[PDB]
Amino acid sequence: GLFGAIAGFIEGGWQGMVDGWYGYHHSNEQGSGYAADKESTQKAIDGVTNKVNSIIDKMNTQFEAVGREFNNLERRIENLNKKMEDGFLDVWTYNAELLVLMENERTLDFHDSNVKNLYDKVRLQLRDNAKELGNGCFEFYHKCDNECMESVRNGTYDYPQYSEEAR
Amino acid sequence: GLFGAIAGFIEGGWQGMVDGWYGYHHSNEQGSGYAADKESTQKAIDGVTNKVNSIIDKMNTQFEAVGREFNNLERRIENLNKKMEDGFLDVWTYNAELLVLMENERTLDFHDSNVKNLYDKVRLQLRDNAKELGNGCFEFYHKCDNECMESVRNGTYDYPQYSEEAR
Amino acid sequence: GLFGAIAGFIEGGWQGMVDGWYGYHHSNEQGSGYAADKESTQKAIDGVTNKVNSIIDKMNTQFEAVGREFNNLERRIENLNKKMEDGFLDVWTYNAELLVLMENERTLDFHDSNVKNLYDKVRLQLRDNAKELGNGCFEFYHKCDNECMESVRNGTYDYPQYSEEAR
Amino acid sequence: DPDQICIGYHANNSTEQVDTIMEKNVTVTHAQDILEKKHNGKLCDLDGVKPLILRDCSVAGWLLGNPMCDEFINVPEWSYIVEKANPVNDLCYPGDFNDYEELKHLLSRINHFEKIQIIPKSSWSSHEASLGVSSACPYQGKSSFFRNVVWLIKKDSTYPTIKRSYNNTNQEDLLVLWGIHHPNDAAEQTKLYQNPTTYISVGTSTLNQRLVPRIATRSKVKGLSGRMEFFWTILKPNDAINFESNGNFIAPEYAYKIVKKGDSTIMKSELEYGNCNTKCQTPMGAINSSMPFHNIHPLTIGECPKYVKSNRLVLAIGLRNSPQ
Amino acid sequence: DPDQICIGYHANNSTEQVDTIMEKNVTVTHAQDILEKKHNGKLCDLDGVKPLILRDCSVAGWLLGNPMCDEFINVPEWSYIVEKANPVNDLCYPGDFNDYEELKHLLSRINHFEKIQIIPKSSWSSHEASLGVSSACPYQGKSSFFRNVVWLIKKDSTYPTIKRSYNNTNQEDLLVLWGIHHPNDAAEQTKLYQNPTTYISVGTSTLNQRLVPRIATRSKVKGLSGRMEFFWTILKPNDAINFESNGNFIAPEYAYKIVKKGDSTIMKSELEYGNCNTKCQTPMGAINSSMPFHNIHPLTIGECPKYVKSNRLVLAIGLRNSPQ
Amino acid sequence: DPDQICIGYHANNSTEQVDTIMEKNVTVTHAQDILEKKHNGKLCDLDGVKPLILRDCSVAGWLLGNPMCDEFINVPEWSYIVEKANPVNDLCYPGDFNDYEELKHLLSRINHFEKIQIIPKSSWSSHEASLGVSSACPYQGKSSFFRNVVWLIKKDSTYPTIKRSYNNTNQEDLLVLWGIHHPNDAAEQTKLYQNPTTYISVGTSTLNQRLVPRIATRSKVKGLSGRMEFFWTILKPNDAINFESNGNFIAPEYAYKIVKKGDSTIMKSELEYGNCNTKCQTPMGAINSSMPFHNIHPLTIGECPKYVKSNRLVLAIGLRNSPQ
Numbered sequence A, B, C: 001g002l003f004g005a006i007a008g009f010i011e012g013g014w015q016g017m018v019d020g021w022y023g024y025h026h027s028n029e030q031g032s033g034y035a036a037d038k039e040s041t042q043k044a045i046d047g048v049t050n051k052v053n054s055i056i057d058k059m060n061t062q063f064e065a066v067g068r069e070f071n072n073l074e075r076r077i078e079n080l081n082k083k084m085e086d087g088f089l090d091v092w093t094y095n096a097e098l099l100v101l102m103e104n105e106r107t108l109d110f111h112d113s114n115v116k117n118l119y120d121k122v123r124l125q126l127r128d129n130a131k132e133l134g135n136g137c138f139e140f141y142h143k144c145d146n147e148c149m150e151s152v153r154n155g156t157y158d159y160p161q162y163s164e165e166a167r
Numbered sequence D, E, F: 001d002p003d004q005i006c007i008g009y010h011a012n013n014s015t016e017q018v019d020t021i022m023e024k025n026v027t028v029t030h031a032q033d034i035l036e037k038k039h040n041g042k043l044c045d046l047d048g049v050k051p052l053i054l055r056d057c058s059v060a061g062w063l064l065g066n067p068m069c070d071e072f073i074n075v076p077e078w079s080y081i082v083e084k085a086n087p088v089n090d091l092c093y094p095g096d097f098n099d100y101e102e103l104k105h106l107l108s109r110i111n112h113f114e115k116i117q118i119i120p121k122s123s124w125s126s127h128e129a130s131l132g133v134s135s136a137c138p139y140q141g142k143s144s145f146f147r148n149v150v151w152l153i154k155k156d157s158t159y160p161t162i163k164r165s166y167n168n169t170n171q172e173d174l175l176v177l178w179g180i181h182h183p184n185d186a187a188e189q190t191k192l193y194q195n196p197t198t199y200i201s202v203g204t205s206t207l208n209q210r211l212v213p214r215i216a217t218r219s220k221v222k223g224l225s226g227r228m229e230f231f232w233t234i235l236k237p238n239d240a241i242n243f244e245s246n247g248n249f250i251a252p253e254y255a256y257k258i259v260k261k262g263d264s265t266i267m268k269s270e271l272e273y274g275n276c277n278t279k280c281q282t283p284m285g286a287i288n289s290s291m292p293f294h295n296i297h298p299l300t301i302g303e304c305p306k307y308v309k310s311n312r313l314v315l316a317i318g319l320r321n322s323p324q
C-alpha cells in the first residue's frame, strides 16, 4: 500500500482487536492484550462516512418521465432519443464504475496512512528507550508495566524517567 | 492528514511566518525567528496554480443557443429537450461538486507532503547531532549560531564539524 | 513528489539498472553493480497495467448510427441534436483530459511510494549497523561482502552477527 | 523476555471483496453497495397520487367509450397512465385518431378530470340518433358504438344541415372529441346521409377546420371497409365550439373538463395496481430512490437514481482483510 | 537552553472554508471559487453584434407590419432576437402563421436583412387595393392593416383573376410573405370578392401550393369571426414566384432580402438594451465566460460556462488554517 | 572505503512527456496513448455486412429507377447507406417525395430486399402505357422515365377510370411506390388525361388517401413547369392495396419485399468501397474500436470509441525520467 504499513511492514491484521480499527498490542510481565486507539478510529469512521454520504448526497435527482411516445413515421426523432438515453447511460456507467475503483483506492490508502501515523507517534515518544523491530513492534530496554504501557498509548510517555534503566 | 505533519506531529501553523507557505523557526543564543523555504513554497504555488488552471482551461466551451421553440402540439419533443437539459445539468452538477471535494483533499494532502518532505530533509542532515523532539523541532547537542542555522536551511550542514561537541 | 524519494532524497534514476523499475546498487571490496527488486517491480507492473485496463475496459460501448436526417423545415429538431452532440463531446472531452491529468499524478506518486517503501525496508533491517547518508544510500560500519549484500536485498540481514564489528 | 508494544489494525471474518483502480478482488473488513438492484414488483402511487390503469383498453378506447371496454369509473386525478403493450380494445370501428400521441402526452398527468354531457343525445330532432351502430362495436350481444359520441344518420330520407354550438361555461378547459365517417363508395354515402357531397366544419377562437369524407377502396378490417377518423381540441373557458355538417358527422355527446398542472408519460406495463406508494416507478416494479444508481429498467417515471449498466458498485468502508 | 530548529507552515487570519471528500467546513489560508454567480442585468451585443429587440411586438407582427407596432427601423444584422414573454402586438387581425416556429428559428441570427418593395400597391389596376382595412388593426385612430401586405377586394362588383410574378433579380435569398382570408360565410365571401368559389395558387421552382378559403362558424376575436392565415417561402436568386387568385388573396407588397450564415434562437426577456458587449447572454443579464461553471439561468445564448445547480464551488489553494 | 548499499530506480533514454494535474511536460520512462487518431481511408463492411453504396444516385432515384442511374444490381442486405453529399441523379423529372427522410431512415439497414413485379406494364389495356416519357429523364439518347413506375396517359381521347388491386401474397412486408403528376394548366391536363377533374385514391387496411392534382404556375426546372409527387406505404403480408384514378396516376410496376431487423442511418461520404471489415465506420475511413476515445469524425456508424476534441491522451506507465 501507499504508506507501507498495512500488509506492509505490519504484515497482517488482528482478529483479537474487536473494538476499533487501529490500535496497540502490548506484552509485559503482567500479561498481554489489545487496546483500540479510540481517537484515530473515530476520526477515520467520520471520514469514510463523510465520503460515502458525499457520493450519495451530491447527486441531483429530479422528476423525469421516460416512455416511448413517438409513432411509426417519427423514427428519426425516436433515434434522437435513443442516442440521448444511451449517451447518458454510457456517461453514468463509466463515471460510476471509475468512481468506485478510484475511491476504493483512496479509502484503503487512508487506512494505511492512519496506521502509519499512529506508529510514528509511538516511535517518536520512545526514541532510543526501545528497539524498533521493523514489524510494527517496539522492544523496550526497560520494564514497562501496565501504567507505563498506557502512557505510551495516551501520548504521555516520560522518556527521561527510563533512560537510565534503558542504558 | 495523510502525511501526518500538518495538524499532526506539527500541531499548528505559524502566523509569524508571513513570506512563504513552509519553512523554519530557529532559536539560539543570538535570538529567534522565521525563515520561509523559498524553493518548496514556489514549487507548491506553481503546482496548485497549475491544478486550478487545468480545471478551468480543459473545459471545452462552444456556442449554443438555448430557447424554447416548440409549440403546444410539439410537447413530446419539448419533453425530449427537457430530459436532455436536465440530464446534462445532473452530470455537470455531480461532477463539479465531486471534483471540488476530491481536489480539495488532494491539495491539503499535497501541502502536508511538502511539510513532511522538508522535515525529513533536515532530519537526515542533523542525524544524531540533535534530538528529534516529536513536534517538528530538533534540539541541538551543540551550539548552532546564525550561520550554522543557515547551513541547515540551505542543505549544507556539516555534521562532522560538530559531532565532537555533540558527544 | 508526494513520498519524497523519486527526484527527492533519491535525486535521480539509474540508466545502469535495466532489468527492473526499482532496486539496489551495492559497492564493496569485491566490486559493484545493480540488482532489480523483482517483487516490487512485478507488483507495480501489475498495478499500473490494471489501472490502464480499467480505464479502457469500463467504457460501455454500444451501436449508434450518427447522421443528419432532418430537412430544411426541421431545423429546430436539428438544433436539439446539435445541443445533444455538443453536450456529450464537452462531457467526454473534459472527463478524458482530467482523468489523464489526475491518473498520471497518481501513477508517478505510486512509483514514488514503492521506492520509499523499499528504502524503509532496508533501513529497518540495518538499523545502527550502517549510516543513513540521506541520498538513498547506507554506509556500513562493517564489511558487507556479496552474500551479506544479498541478505539485505532478500530481507534476511542478520543484525546481531555484525553489531560487534560495527561498534 | 523484554516487554513489547506493537501497532496494528483490525481484522475480521469478512469475505467481502472490492475492486480498486490498481487491484481486483481485494478482501475488506466492511463494504457498502451503492447500486440499487431491487424493486417491489408492483405499480404504485407516485407521491402519492394513483396512476390511471387502463387494463385492456387504449387511451382512445377509454376516452371515446369503446363498449368492449370496462364501464367508465371516474378517477378525478392521476400521476401517470398505464397501458398494456398491445391493448385489445382500442378503436372497435376501424380508423384513426388525429394527433393521438400528443393527446396521450397531454393526458399523462391530470389534476382534475370530469366527464360532462355537452350535447344531449335526445336533442337531435331532425336526424336519427339511435341507429348509429355496428357489429364491430358490440355491447351485450347487440351491435353498438363508442358511447361518448353519436353516429348520426339521415331521417326519413333527409339529412338537414346541422348547426350546433357548445359554450364552455365551466371554469376549466374542456377536451372535446368528434369524428368523421369515411364510407366505401357513393351508394353507401347517400344510403346513410342522403347528401352525396358533404363536409364537417368546426370553429373555435383558434380552430378553423373543414373535414370532407375521403372515398378509397379499403381493405376490410373486422369485415368493414369504412373508417372513422377522430379529432379533438381543448376548448378554453368562455370559448364556444361551433359544428356545421350535412353528413358523415360523429357528434360529441360527452366531453371532459380538465385541469393540467404538469406532465408525465404513458407507461407500458402488464402489472396491476399494488396499493403502494413510491417516488420512482418502473414497468416491472417500484423502487427506492435512496441509492445514487440503479440497474432495474430505463423507462422510469419519477425521481429516480441514475440508470447504469452494472451488476455491482461496492465501496470499501473498512480495511484490507486477509481472504479465506 | 539548547538551541533549536523547527519545521512549520504558514497560518493567517483567513476564515474561508472549503469542503473535502472526507471532511466538511475545513478552514484554509486561501481559497478560490470557480462558480460564476454574477450577471450585469442587461441585454448586450453578442461578439459584438447587437440583438434585434422587438419591444412589444412578436416576430410575426414585426414582419407583417402590424400598425400597432413601432415604425420599421432597419437593423441590417443581428445575433439573436429578444421577445417579451407575451408580446401585446402580434396578429392584429386574428389568424395563424404557417410554420411560424421554423421561420423564427431561421430569422434568429441574420447577417444581412433588407426590406424591399416587390409588388407596388399602386399596380393593382383591376382590384381595389385601398379598402383592405379593419378596426382590429388601427393606425392613428383609423382602421388599417398589416403594412407589408395588401388585402385586395373586388372593384365594381368584379374580381378578375390575378396572375402576377416576381422574379428575384437580387443576389440574395428573398423571404416572401402572403396570406389568405377565411370569411364567416358565403354572403361575406361574395360581398368582398364577388366569386363564391376561390383559390390562391403559389408556385416557385420548389413550391406547389393551392390554398382555398375554409368556412367555419368561428368565435369572435376582437369582434371578428373571420381569419387571416399567413404563409412564407424563401425565394432563391433567379427563381420566380407566381401567384394566381380569384379571391381571398392577401398579396405581398414588401419582402425581405436575407443572408444567413448560422443560427441562434429567440430569447424571452423583459429587459431592454444596455449598450454592452458579451460572449454569453442570459435573459436576466449577460455574464463573463472565464469560470468553468455558472448558476445564473439555463436559457443562455453564446459561449457559456457549464450550467449547474450549486451555490458555491470553492477550491482550496492554501493550507489548513485554525478557525475562529 | 566503507561498503555501501543504495536504493534507486530505473531511468532510460525515453523523451516521452506526459502532463499531470500539478505539472506539465513531465518526462517519463514509458507512456501509452489512449486516444485513437488513425483510420484506414476506406468504407468497409459493418460486422461484416456490406453497405449499399449509391455512387451518383439518391435513395429516391435508386428506388424509383431514375434511368440516368446505374442499372439495378440486386443487393439483398446491407448495414448502412452511403450517399454522396450532393447526388447528381435524384428525381430526373422535377418534384417531391413525400416523407422522404423517414423512408431513408427505414431503408438505412435492411435484412432482406427484393424487387418484384406487382403490376405488369403490359396489363394496361385501356390506357397508353408506353408514351410516359420526358426529355428530362433520358435513357440512351431517348426520352424515358423512372423505370419502376409507369406514367399512364389517355388512349384514343379517353382515360377510363382505373380500379386495380395488388394483394401481398408474400411472407414479407412490401414497400410500394406511386405518384401523381401536377400539370401546368387545364389545357395540358385534358391533353394528357382527357378528364379535367381528377383524383387518385389509395386504400390499404391502414391507408386512406385521396390525391388531387394541384395547378400552380411554376418555374421551369430542366425546361419543365410540371411536377411529379411520389408517395409510399408498407403493405403488410395479406393486406391489399387498392388504386382508383381517372387521371394523373403514376402507377407502380415494381415494388420491394423488405425484412427489417434494426436501424442505422445514411452516411454522407465521397469514398468508394474498400473490401474491408470494421466495427466502427466514419465518412473519412473505418477505425479500430479498441481505444476508449477517438478524434476522427463525429458522424460515425457502429460501436465506436467516445468522440472527443483532443489531440492526445497520454497516460504515464513508467517513472519520472530526466529529460534531454
Ligand SMILES: *[C@@H]1O[C@H](CO[C@H]2O[C@@H](C)[C@@H](O)[C@@H](O)[C@@H]2O)[C@@H](O[C@@H]2O[C@H](CO)[C@@H](O[C@@H]3O[C@H](CO[C@H]4O[C@H](CO)[C@@H](O)[C@H](O)[C@@H]4O)[C@@H](O)[C@H](O[C@@H]4O[C@H](CO)[C@@H](O)[C@H](O)[C@@H]4O)[C@@H]3O)[C@H](O)[C@H]2NC(C)=O)[C@H](O)[C@H]1NC(C)=O
Pocket (backbone or CB within 6 Å): D167, D168, D238, D239, D240, E219, E220
Ligand atoms: C360564450 O358564452 C359567454 C357568456 O354568455 C352569456 O351571455 C349570453 C350570451 C347568454 O347566453 C348567457 O346565458 C351567457 O351566460 C359569451 O359572452 C357573452 O357574449 C355576448 C355576445 O354574444 C354578450 O351579450 C351582450 O351583452 C350585452 C350586455 O353586456 C353587459 O351585461 C352583461 C350582463 O350583466 C355583462 O356580462 C357584460 O360584461 C356587460 O356589462 C348586451 O347589451 C348585448 O346586446 C344585445 O346584442 C344582441 C346580439 O349580440 C342583440 O340580440 C340585442 O338586441 C342587443 O343589441 C349582448 O346581449 C355578453 O355580455 C357576453 N357575456 C360575458 C362575456 O360574460 C361568449 O361570447 C360566448 N363565447 C363565444 C361565442 O365564443
Ligand SMILES: *[C@@H]1O[C@H](CO[C@H]2O[C@@H](C)[C@@H](O)[C@@H](O)[C@@H]2O)[C@@H](O[C@@H]2O[C@H](CO)[C@@H](O[C@@H]3O[C@H](CO[C@H]4O[C@H](CO)[C@@H](O)[C@H](O)[C@@H]4O)[C@@H](O)[C@H](O[C@@H]4O[C@H](CO)[C@@H](O)[C@H](O)[C@@H]4O)[C@@H]3O)[C@H](O)[C@H]2NC(C)=O)[C@H](O)[C@H]1NC(C)=O
Pocket (backbone or CB within 6 Å): E167, E168, E238, E239, E240, F219, F220
Ligand atoms: C427570372 O429571371 C431570369 C432573368 O431574366 C432576364 O431575361 C429576360 C427574361 C428579361 O426579363 C430580363 O429583363 C431578365 O434580366 C430568367 O432567366 C432568363 O429566362 C429566359 C427564359 O424565359 C431567357 O430568355 C431567353 O433568352 C435567349 C437568349 O439567351 C442568351 O442571351 C442572354 C442575354 O445575353 C443570356 O442571358 C443567356 O444566357 C443566353 O446566352 C433568347 O434567345 C430566348 O429566345 C426567345 O424566347 C422567347 C420565349 O421564351 C420568345 O419570346 C422569343 O421569340 C425567343 O424565341 C429567350 O429570350 C433568358 O436568357 C434567361 N436569362 C438568364 C438565365 O440570365 C429566369 O428564367 C427567371 N426565373 C424563372 C422564370 O423562374
Ligand SMILES: *[C@@H]1O[C@H](CO[C@H]2O[C@@H](C)[C@@H](O)[C@@H](O)[C@@H]2O)[C@@H](O[C@@H]2O[C@H](CO)[C@@H](O[C@@H]3O[C@H](CO[C@H]4O[C@H](CO)[C@@H](O)[C@H](O)[C@@H]4O)[C@@H](O)[C@H](O[C@@H]4O[C@H](CO)[C@@H](O)[C@H](O)[C@@H]4O)[C@@H]3O)[C@H](O)[C@H]2NC(C)=O)[C@H](O)[C@H]1NC(C)=O
Pocket (backbone or CB within 6 Å): D219, D220, F167, F168, F238, F239, F240
Ligand atoms: C388478400 O388475399 C388473401 C388470400 O386470398 C386467397 O383467397 C381468394 C380470395 C383467392 O384470391 C386466392 O387466390 C387467395 O389465395 C385474402 O384472404 C381471403 O379473403 C377472402 C374474402 O375475400 C376469403 O374468401 C372466402 O373464402 C371462404 C372459404 O374460407 C375457407 O376456406 C379457405 C380455403 O381453404 C380458407 O383459407 C379459409 O380460412 C376458410 O377455411 C368462402 O366460403 C367465401 O365464400 C364466398 O364469398 C364470395 C365473396 O366474398 C362469393 O363470391 C361466394 O359466393 C362465396 O359466398 C370466400 O371465398 C378467403 O378465405 C381468405 N383467405 C385467407 C385469409 O387465407 C385477403 O382478404 C386479401 N386481403 C385483402 C382484401 O385485404
Ligand SMILES: CC(=O)N[C@@H]1[C@@H](O)[C@H](O[C@@H]2O[C@H](CO)[C@H](O)[C@H](O[C@]3(C(=O)O)C[C@H](O)[C@@H](NC(C)=O)[C@H]([C@H](O)[C@H](O)CO)O3)[C@H]2O)[C@@H](CO)O[C@H]1O
Pocket (backbone or CB within 6 Å): D131, D132, D133, D134, D135, D136, D143, D151, D153, D183, D184, D188, D192, D222, D223, D224, D225, D226, D227
Ligand atoms: C364480403 C361480403 O360477403 N359482404 C360484404 C359485407 O360484409 C359488407 O357489409 C357490411 O358487413 C358487415 C359484416 O362484415 C356488417 O354486417 C355491416 O353492417 C353494419 C355494421 O354492423 O357495421 C350494420 C349497421 O346497422 C350499419 N350502421 C349504420 C349506421 O348504417 C353499418 C354501416 O352501414 C357501415 O358500417 C358503414 O360503413 O353496417 C355491413 O354493412 C359490404 C359493405 O358494402 O360489402 C360486402 O362485400
Ligand SMILES: CC(=O)N[C@@H]1[C@@H](O)[C@H](O[C@@H]2O[C@H](CO)[C@H](O)[C@H](O[C@]3(C(=O)O)C[C@H](O)[C@@H](NC(C)=O)[C@H]([C@H](O)[C@H](O)CO)O3)[C@H]2O)[C@@H](CO)O[C@H]1O
Pocket (backbone or CB within 6 Å): E131, E132, E133, E134, E135, E136, E143, E151, E153, E183, E184, E188, E192, E222, E223, E224, E225, E226, E227
Ligand atoms: C354582434 C354584432 O352585433 N354584430 C356582429 C358584427 O360585429 C360583425 O361585423 C363586423 O363587426 C366588426 C366589429 O366587431 C367590424 O365593425 C367589422 O367591420 C369591418 C372591420 O373593421 O373589420 C369593416 C371593414 O371595412 C371590412 N373590410 C373589408 C376589406 O371589407 C371588414 C371585413 O368585411 C371583415 O373583417 C371580413 O371578415 O369588416 C364588421 O364587419 C358581423 C360579421 O358578419 O357579425 C355581427 O353579428
Ligand SMILES: CC(=O)N[C@@H]1[C@@H](O)[C@H](O[C@@H]2O[C@H](CO)[C@H](O)[C@H](O[C@]3(C(=O)O)C[C@H](O)[C@@H](NC(C)=O)[C@H]([C@H](O)[C@H](O)CO)O3)[C@H]2O)[C@@H](CO)O[C@H]1O
Pocket (backbone or CB within 6 Å): F131, F132, F133, F134, F135, F136, F143, F151, F153, F183, F184, F188, F192, F222, F223, F224, F225, F226, F227
Ligand atoms: C419556353 C418555350 O419556348 N417553350 C416551353 C416548352 O419548353 C414547354 O413544353 C415542354 O418543353 C420541354 C423542353 O423544355 C419538353 O420538350 C416537353 O416535352 C415533353 C417532355 O419531354 O417532357 C414531351 C413528352 O412526350 C411529354 N410526355 C407526355 C407523357 O405527354 C411531356 C409532358 O407532356 C409534360 O412534361 C407534362 O408536364 O412533355 C414540352 O412539353 C411548354 C409547356 O407548356 O411551355 C413552353 O413555354
Ligand SMILES: *[C@@H]1O[C@H](CO)[C@@H](O)[C@H](O)[C@H]1NC(C)=O
Pocket (backbone or CB within 6 Å): D013
Ligand atoms: C463473523 O463474526 C461476526 C461478529 O462477531 C459473527 O456475528 C458472525 O456470526 C461470524 N460469522 C461466522 C461465525 O460464520
Ligand SMILES: *[C@@H]1O[C@H](CO)[C@@H](O)[C@H](O)[C@H]1NC(C)=O
Pocket (backbone or CB within 6 Å): D024, D025
Ligand atoms: C475476481 O473475481 C471473480 C470471481 O467472482 C472472477 O471471475 C475474476 O476473474 C476475479 N479476478 C481476478 C483477477 O482474480
Ligand SMILES: *[C@@H]1O[C@H](CO)[C@@H](O)[C@H](O)[C@H]1NC(C)=O
Pocket (backbone or CB within 6 Å): E013
Ligand atoms: C488580515 O490580514 C491581512 C494581511 O495582513 C490584512 O490586510 C487584513 O486587514 C487582516 N484582517 C483583519 C485585521 O481583520
Ligand SMILES: *[C@@H]1O[C@H](CO)[C@@H](O)[C@H](O)[C@H]1NC(C)=O
Pocket (backbone or CB within 6 Å): E024, E025
Ligand atoms: C458547515 O457549515 C454550514 C454553516 O455555513 C452548516 O450549515 C453546516 O451544518 C456545517 N456542517 C458541519 C458538519 O459543521
Ligand SMILES: *[C@@H]1O[C@H](CO)[C@@H](O)[C@H](O)[C@H]1NC(C)=O
Pocket (backbone or CB within 6 Å): F013
Ligand atoms: C534507447 O534504448 C533502447 C533500449 O535499449 C534502444 O533499443 C534504442 O535504440 C535506444 N535509442 C537510441 C540509441 O537512440
Ligand SMILES: *[C@@H]1O[C@H](CO)[C@@H](O)[C@H](O)[C@H]1NC(C)=O
Pocket (backbone or CB within 6 Å): F024, F025
Ligand atoms: C509543454 O510542451 C509544449 C511543446 O510541445 C509547449 O508548447 C508548452 O508550452 C510546454 N509547456 C511548458 C510549461 O513547458
